[PDB]
Design an enzyme around this catalytic site. Structure first.
Site, mmCIF file in Angstrom:
data_model
loop_
_atom_site.group_PDB
_atom_site.id
_atom_site.type_symbol
_atom_site.label_atom_id
_atom_site.label_comp_id
_atom_site.label_asym_id
_atom_site.label_seq_id
_atom_site.Cartn_x
_atom_site.Cartn_y
_atom_site.Cartn_z
ATOM 1 N N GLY A 31 31.740 -33.662 -90.525
ATOM 2 C CA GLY A 31 31.338 -34.721 -91.441
ATOM 3 C C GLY A 31 31.643 -36.124 -90.970
ATOM 4 N N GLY A 33 34.252 -37.922 -90.491
ATOM 5 C CA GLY A 33 35.190 -38.682 -91.314
ATOM 6 C C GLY A 33 34.989 -38.629 -92.819
ATOM 7 C CG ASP A 150 36.567 -33.778 -110.005
ATOM 8 O OD1 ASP A 150 35.496 -34.322 -110.378
ATOM 9 O OD2 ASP A 150 37.352 -34.318 -109.253
ATOM 10 N NE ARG A 154 33.397 -36.725 -107.511
ATOM 11 C CZ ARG A 154 33.015 -37.050 -108.747
ATOM 12 N NH1 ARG A 154 31.849 -37.643 -108.957
ATOM 13 N NH2 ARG A 154 33.796 -36.775 -109.782
ATOM 14 C CG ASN A 155 33.832 -32.667 -106.373
ATOM 15 O OD1 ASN A 155 34.162 -33.185 -105.297
ATOM 16 N ND2 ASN A 155 34.206 -33.212 -107.514
ATOM 17 C CG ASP A 168 36.943 -31.011 -105.494
ATOM 18 O OD1 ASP A 168 37.898 -31.202 -104.704
ATOM 19 O OD2 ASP A 168 36.792 -31.639 -106.558
#
Ligand SMILES: O=c1[nH]ccc2c1ccn2Cc1ccccc1
Length: 283
Positions: A31, A33, A150, A154-155, A168
């Site tokens: 990825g 970073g 959560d 994005r997760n 996540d």
């Protein structure tokens, strides 16, 4: 590591990856970073099949009490397997270095960056299919009384076959924790979680509704004009995320049901799978 309790060592054996089974490529990150120090690795199974994995070193684990809690978390998460949930491949207990978490490599990274990427062109059908996959993964987690806390685009991650994996959670948590040299999820949360700081499967349903909105907007930020502080008042007034331009009306009805102020009135993930699968099949 000889200071570990022997019955706990016996219990974790089936989760442990021996150092001769894993080749860690500490010279290359996944990825570039975006996920901090997550390394490419190669895991050898019992038949010698090479498995591409993501490896993270857990530097926050410094003492034997923290190692033991980590072994336990590995034991619990190894029992969670579903096509739409990120699996744990195993853990490494090193003589030299912090313990390692080994997960399956996700070729297409996180779902939010995938849908935001201008080069990718998923259809409305593909986007609904991603939502159905997330609903199936959450139906599995909820069936085992596991509360995510959560859930957001994005997760979730995407593999080489574009299979969505809810991520996540458990040993895959802290997906975006970055370490800086000199520098120091309220818009997805259910109204009652904003008020009480408690989370349930019904608050994961609310978050799922926001994730569905992210999918249909190709990763737009929700409530861009509302401060995180003001979200509670905004929701108490009965204001909600608006219908995205390319979102089918029955799918927006599903999103609105996820944001009912009474948690008991929200659909279960089993109901969400049922409803979204029927919508998906009309395309
Ligand atoms: O390719 C991947 N597959 C699975 C997980 C994952 C990647 C890239 C980042 N991450 C996040 C993460 C990794 C390891 C430990 C904890 C979180």
């Amino acid at each position: 590591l000889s200071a570990l309790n022997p019955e706990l060592v016996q219990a974790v054996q089936h989760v442990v990856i021996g150092p001769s089974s894993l080749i860690v490529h500490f010279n290359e990150v996944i990825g570039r970073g975006h996920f901090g120090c997550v390394y490419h690795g190669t895991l050898l199974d019992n038949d010698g099949k090479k498995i591409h994995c993501a490896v993270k070193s857990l530097n926050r684990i410094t003492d034997i009490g923290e190692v033991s809690q980590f072994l336990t978390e590995g034991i619990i998460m190894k029992d969670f397997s579903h096509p739409n949930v990120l699996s744990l491949l195993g853990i490494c207990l090193r003589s030299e270095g912090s313990p390692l978490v080994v997960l399956p490599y996700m070729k297409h990274g996180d779902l939010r960056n995938f849908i935001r990427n201008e080069t990718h062109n998923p259809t409305v059908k593909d986007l609904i299919g991603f939502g159905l996959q997330v609903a199936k993964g959450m139906k599995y987690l909820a069936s085992k009384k596991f509360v995510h806390r959560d859930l957001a685009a994005r997760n979730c991650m995407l593999d080489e076959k574009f299979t969505v994996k809810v991520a996540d959670f458990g040993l895959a948590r802290d997906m975006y924790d970055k370490e800086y040299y000199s520098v120091h999820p309220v818009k997805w949360m259910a109204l009652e979680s904003l008020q009480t700081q408690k989370f349930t499967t019904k608050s994961d349903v609310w978050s799922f509704g926001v994730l569905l909105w992210e999918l249909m907007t190709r990763g737009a930020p929700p409530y861009p004009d509302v401060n995180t502080f003001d979200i509670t008042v905004y929701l108490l007034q009965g204001r909600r995320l608006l219908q995205p331009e390319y979102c089918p009306d029955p799918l927006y009805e599903v999103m609105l049901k996820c944001w009912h102020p009474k948690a008991e009135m929200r659909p279960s993930f089993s109901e969400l799978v049922s409803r979204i699968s029927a919508i998906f099949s009309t395309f």
